Amino acid sequence: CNPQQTRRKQQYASIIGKQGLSKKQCGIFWDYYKRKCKKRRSTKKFI
Amino acid sequence: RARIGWRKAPGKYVGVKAHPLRPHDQRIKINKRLLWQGLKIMLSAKFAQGQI
Amino acid sequence: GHKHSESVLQQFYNRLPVRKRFLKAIRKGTLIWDKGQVKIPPIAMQGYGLPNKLVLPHQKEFNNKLPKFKGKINQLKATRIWFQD
Amino acid sequence: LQIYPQRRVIGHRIEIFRGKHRRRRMVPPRIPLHPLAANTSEETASKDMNLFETYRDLQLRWKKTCRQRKKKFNIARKWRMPRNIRPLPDPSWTLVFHVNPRSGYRREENILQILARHPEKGRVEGSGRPRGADGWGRDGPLPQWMQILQRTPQEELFCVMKSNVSTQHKVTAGDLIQAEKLHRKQAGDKVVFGTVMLVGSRDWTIIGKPTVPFAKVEATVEEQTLAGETLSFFYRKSRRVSRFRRIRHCVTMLRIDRIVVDPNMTVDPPAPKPDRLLDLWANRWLYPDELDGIKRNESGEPVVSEIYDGREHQKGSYQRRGLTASYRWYPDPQSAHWRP
Amino acid sequence: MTTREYEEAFLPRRLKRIKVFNTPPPSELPAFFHKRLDNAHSNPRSILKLYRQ
Amino acid sequence: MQIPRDVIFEVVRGFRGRSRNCIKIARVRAMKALLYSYIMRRQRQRRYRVFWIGRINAAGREWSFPYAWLATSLWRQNIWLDRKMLANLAETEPASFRALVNEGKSVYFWNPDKVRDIQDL
Amino acid sequence: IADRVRTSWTYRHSRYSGGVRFSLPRFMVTKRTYLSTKFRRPSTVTKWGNPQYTLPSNVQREMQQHTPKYCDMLFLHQEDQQSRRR
Amino acid sequence: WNRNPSARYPKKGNKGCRPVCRAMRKIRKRLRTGR
Amino acid sequence: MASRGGTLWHLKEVVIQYSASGNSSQGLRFFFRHLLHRWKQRNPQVQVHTVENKYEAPKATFKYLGERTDSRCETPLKDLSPGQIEQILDLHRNSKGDNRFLKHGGPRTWTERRSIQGLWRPSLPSQ
Amino acid sequence: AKEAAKRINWGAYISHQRGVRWHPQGAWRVQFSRRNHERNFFVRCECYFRVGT
Amino acid sequence: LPNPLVHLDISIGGRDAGRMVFQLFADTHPITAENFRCLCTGETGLGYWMRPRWYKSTPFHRIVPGFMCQGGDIHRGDGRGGECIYGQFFRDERFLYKHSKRGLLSMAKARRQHTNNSQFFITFDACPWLDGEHVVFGQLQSGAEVLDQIEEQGTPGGWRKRPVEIWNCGELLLERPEKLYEPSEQVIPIPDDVYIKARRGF
RNA sequence: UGAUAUAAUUAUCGUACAAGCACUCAGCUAGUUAUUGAGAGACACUCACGAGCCCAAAA
RNA sequence: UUGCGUACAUUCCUUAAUAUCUGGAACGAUAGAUUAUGAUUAGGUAGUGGAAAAAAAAAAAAAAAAAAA
RNA sequence: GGACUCCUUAACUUAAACUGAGGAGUCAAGUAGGUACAAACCGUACAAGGAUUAAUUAUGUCCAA
RNA sequence: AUUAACAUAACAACAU
RNA sequence: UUUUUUU
RNA sequence: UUUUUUUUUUUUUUU
């Protein structure tokens, strides 16, 4: 309930919209970014 | 200094909450008629869209 | 000064840029302050009429009919005279 | 116990009004009521039955409990004393000369010399309203020597025009002026302001009491965008009240080109008749390509014209869209628009 | 009762005062002044004021 | 709450120590800073109208013609010129101003129906 | 949606609520970071945003007679006196 | 005598003859009307 | 905007970043098929470029001709109508820039020649 | 009221034309609204015909 | 019914000038005519300011030779005053007649639109430019010698050489100017009386 | 240099003002919940069926 | 005698109206582009009401879209 | 279960900003203006918002202005 | 390795 | 840009 | 005799 959350959200938002990001690059958001990418890749799956 | 009672009380400690979450059930009630109708509507939609 | 509160009338006097000699007189009553000047208070003579500037608007008509003095202080023959408040 | 009324009217008569003290309607009714009755029937009819008094009414007046709120009704303030300036004299303009032949100051030519000696000879007075063969002159045509006014260059010319209904600016040769938003205007749009109050030069000064009907200003739209952001804040301490806003005002930029002064000028033509009425209410003018679908008769005029000519329906309508030759306002006798 | 000042204290200061007495004006100036001249015979100021009027 | 946090910092740019950086102090500072401008922008008009009137009177007095008279003279003539343009003229166009003053004087100053000469008397 | 809020009995449904009207002036303000002009204005720009110069015209021309400044008040006074005394 | 406090300073021009917290207004009238 | 008699424009280049799969870019996509071609022709003096980006919100950047700091601007185009887009475009084209210093008010006049006749100075008659 | 109603002529305000209506301002209002997103053309006529004119 | 015939007695510098007679156009301008007749007769009583609404003893605040002469103020007598029987201000009337005759009467106006009051003015000459801006309701029938004398007291600046005031007023008991357009009948769905009746409960 | 301006918060009839807290910043922290309630002239959303509606626990 | 200074225009430009009555019971309609002389309007403690936002997580709808590549 | 002022009036030392009643305005919940300096008095065509414009009001017109 | 408060330094300024 | 003092 | 008042924020009383 604070300034810290705004910084984290701004940081997150700045990296979310990209591709080919490394684990060392992502940081604390690595899990989130991996889930996002896997979610995205769902549309390309056919019978 | 200000008054203080319990060591572990809301605001005086980390983890204590005044309105903590409680386990419960997320199930809801619904009329059978609604379901019955929605089945039909879905079926017709399928036909409409050509997914059958 | 040392006094905490003072009367408005006294305060007024206190603000007069004049000598102590005239201040005392003013305080006493022998002198008055008007239009930034100090002069003798008006003289009220017995029987004669007072100045038109001191009576009420409705009293001027009756005051103008009273006798008037057009002489010097030495020639004045009034039984009693005093300053008009 | 009984409280007697007060009949003695001190000051002004009492007048009750609905609502709070604010800016309300002021236009009088079309059908005023006579203050006197010429018959007993009028007297009897004057009675308002809606307002019939009863015991119940008295009850509400006499109750010790909370009564009706005082914010519903109030007493009207006193009347004002406006100045009656109207009517106004006939519009006219006058001309003067103050030539300075001194070398020190100086550092056509023939007449100028004469004028310098006898500036009084140059006193010319006219009329602002149009006339016949006389034109702008008074009791006859203007002198033939007035053509001198067209010989002076723009580098030594200045005038006072009206950019708005109430705003005035000092227009000069190559000037950048600021005005309000002009509807239906884009880049490369030339405009004409015919509204001028005063003209002058190094030799003469056209006073033009009401206006100058033989003078105009030519401008071009240079900018039409939003202004810079502005911050406004207000609050009351110890009362929990405030307001915050972020407004972006709109302005328009106009660049002056020429200041034409021709005494032989003619009155502007009337309002034009557009071919299509849809553009008047549309958000953009129809393109040339789209205008190709316009039906025409043998005479060459639109066929649609038979239904409706297309004349102006309201005062100052086409002027708002800029279809007029020139812009004019109340000060200009040639103008015609709504006035508050 | 009430005073004139009191009454006046609630009205515009420039408000004109009503007229209490009105009479017809003099139609003939020469005849009006000829009768007035009959009373002024010793006061130079009266003669000068009449001539000025 | 009254003001966004992001803007306070901006508004408090250039202030003294602790007041450019402290949220607490900055709040109270900024509030007053905006309030003063808010209040003054409305009163900015009469402060310039009085200056225009003073310049016009100053100008006018030169040619033995008070503003008091001038105004009336002008208005009676159907002349509708704002004090802003009047004052600008008074400074930039002396000749123009003199023209106006002369125009006005004629109207203002009127002779009676009869003129008497008592020089030889 | 629509032009205005409909208060009529005909339009009192839950399906008629919400929405926002488009506004150009407001769109350039809503959801936009504020930037102060203090300590940011160049030397080439006046207070009102008008262009400004930083070099004499003479110099400008080099690196790329005139009307006198003051008028003649004495001539105006003397001419007015002559015209009134004529 | 009644001369120290601020509830007895006369009205000057442009006050309405009844400013906040006055007593002398009602004292003089009363006096004249009967004491 | 017009300058020097309408022989000089400000607006130079316009870049528009959009997406080919995002729903929010629907308006842009629509615009790119009906009004783009029509708009371009009308304004041949302005270059227009488009950039495709999948996982990024749409936006637009504007470049102006000048030495001032107002020679660049940006504006998002998320959840906007074709008409709105057009409006934005027109605004940008008819504007000289973001105008960070442009003040509403002031003398509302800019002239090189303050006085023609001449300025006022004290004189012996006046004194 | 009931008597006045009878006297009042209600038939004059009736207009046999779509888009034309009476207004309490004392005028004839003309309405014509159309939209076109494809061609980017929107029209909203709000013409008024005053009686006093 | 016959039109009213009002009269005005003017006094120049305390001297009886004469007696002018006017004819009001009640037929065409009933309201306007009524206003002026009631003000002249003084049969309405006091007013807003507790003053009698009577033209008696009123000065002329404006006398411009060859243009017109203004007057009628009852409050101050300077010009910044006026009051009709109806109230402060009243709505205007149809502009039928022009200003093309000597001695025509017409009400005054303020900066605002609808600012008509007791203030009127008599035209000395044709004023085409005044067409449509003012309502014409009266015409001089006799007594042009008084208007000729009044014209002499005016100045271009609107100054007054000698005092000019109305001595007595009243009403007498026993060709028209050009027209701006051609009046024609109109459809009147709602009766006039209804408007009156509505304001009282019915 | 010119003009102009009485930190903020709560209570209170009272901007009450020489009353109560706070040096500053970081983290935490005060209206949570209808398998049981509801439209009651100081304000009560919406869907289905209809003289008919729902169906409890096992399953 | 004739004068003059002065606080407040929704003249100009840009917004807003949710307890059944503002024209609107109009127009348009593939889901509303904001009415140009349109009437009443928009100071507010307590109490009451409407609406827009809060960068996150889940969902088996992130390629039928001009030109260019 | 109310603070100041206007009219009437109870109590008091025809005292006190007290204590208590009858009926109008303002503040409370009101901005800016005037009254020299701190809610209550006068005025307001009384604070949605922006700009360098015009006006009879309390009231002013030797200087600070 | 790490935000703010806090601590030090460098550059930038002339109608003075 | 002061007024008044009957016959 | 009048204009000059609590103008009692200061100067000034220039009539």
PDB file of C-alpha atoms in Angstrom, chain B residues 6-48:
ATOM      1  CA  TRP B   6      -1.182  -7.762  23.182  1.00  0.00           C
ATOM      2  CA  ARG B   7       2.203  -8.267  21.526  1.00  0.00           C
ATOM      3  CA  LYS B   8       0.560  -9.957  18.506  1.00  0.00           C
ATOM      4  CA  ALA B   9      -2.376  -7.682  17.651  1.00  0.00           C
ATOM      5  CA  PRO B  10      -3.538  -5.973  14.434  1.00  0.00           C
ATOM      6  CA  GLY B  11      -1.092  -3.252  13.576  1.00  0.00           C
ATOM      7  CA  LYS B  12       1.320  -4.127  16.351  1.00  0.00           C
ATOM      8  CA  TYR B  13       2.641  -7.214  14.542  1.00  0.00           C
ATOM      9  CA  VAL B  14       3.181  -8.689  11.094  1.00  0.00           C
ATOM     10  CA  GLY B  15       0.686 -11.427  10.132  1.00  0.00           C
ATOM     11  CA  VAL B  16      -2.249 -10.395  12.344  1.00  0.00           C
ATOM     12  CA  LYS B  17      -5.359  -9.192  10.469  1.00  0.00           C
ATOM     13  CA  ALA B  18      -8.597  -7.685  11.761  1.00  0.00           C
ATOM     14  CA  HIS B  19     -10.661  -9.241   8.913  1.00  0.00           C
ATOM     15  CA  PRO B  20      -8.736 -12.339   7.815  1.00  0.00           C
ATOM     16  CA  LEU B  21     -10.009 -14.633   5.067  1.00  0.00           C
ATOM     17  CA  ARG B  22     -12.158 -17.630   6.039  1.00  0.00           C
ATOM     18  CA  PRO B  23     -12.553 -20.909   4.109  1.00  0.00           C
ATOM     19  CA  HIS B  24     -15.932 -21.284   2.383  1.00  0.00           C
ATOM     20  CA  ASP B  25     -17.713 -22.883  -0.574  1.00  0.00           C
ATOM     21  CA  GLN B  26     -17.987 -21.141  -3.969  1.00  0.00           C
ATOM     22  CA  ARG B  27     -21.035 -23.163  -5.134  1.00  0.00           C
ATOM     23  CA  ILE B  28     -24.202 -21.349  -6.155  1.00  0.00           C
ATOM     24  CA  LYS B  29     -27.814 -22.268  -6.847  1.00  0.00           C
ATOM     25  CA  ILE B  30     -29.568 -22.178 -10.206  1.00  0.00           C
ATOM     26  CA  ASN B  31     -32.948 -23.142 -11.607  1.00  0.00           C
ATOM     27  CA  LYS B  32     -33.082 -26.228 -13.809  1.00  0.00           C
ATOM     28  CA  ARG B  33     -35.152 -24.375 -16.363  1.00  0.00           C
ATOM     29  CA  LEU B  34     -32.344 -21.977 -17.093  1.00  0.00           C
ATOM     30  CA  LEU B  35     -29.946 -24.800 -17.769  1.00  0.00           C
ATOM     31  CA  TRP B  36     -32.484 -26.578 -19.906  1.00  0.00           C
ATOM     32  CA  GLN B  37     -32.945 -23.510 -22.041  1.00  0.00           C
ATOM     33  CA  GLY B  38     -29.255 -22.749 -22.223  1.00  0.00           C
ATOM     34  CA  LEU B  39     -28.556 -26.200 -23.599  1.00  0.00           C
ATOM     35  CA  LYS B  40     -30.949 -25.550 -26.433  1.00  0.00           C
ATOM     36  CA  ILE B  41     -29.514 -22.115 -27.040  1.00  0.00           C
ATOM     37  CA  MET B  42     -25.988 -23.525 -27.231  1.00  0.00           C
ATOM     38  CA  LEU B  43     -27.096 -26.234 -29.591  1.00  0.00           C
ATOM     39  CA  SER B  44     -28.763 -23.717 -31.863  1.00  0.00           C
ATOM     40  CA  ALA B  45     -25.663 -21.522 -31.763  1.00  0.00           C
ATOM     41  CA  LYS B  46     -23.584 -24.454 -32.868  1.00  0.00           C
ATOM     42  CA  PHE B  47     -25.789 -24.950 -35.880  1.00  0.00           C
ATOM     43  CA  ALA B  48     -25.789 -21.260 -36.624  1.00  0.00           C
TER      44      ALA B  48
END
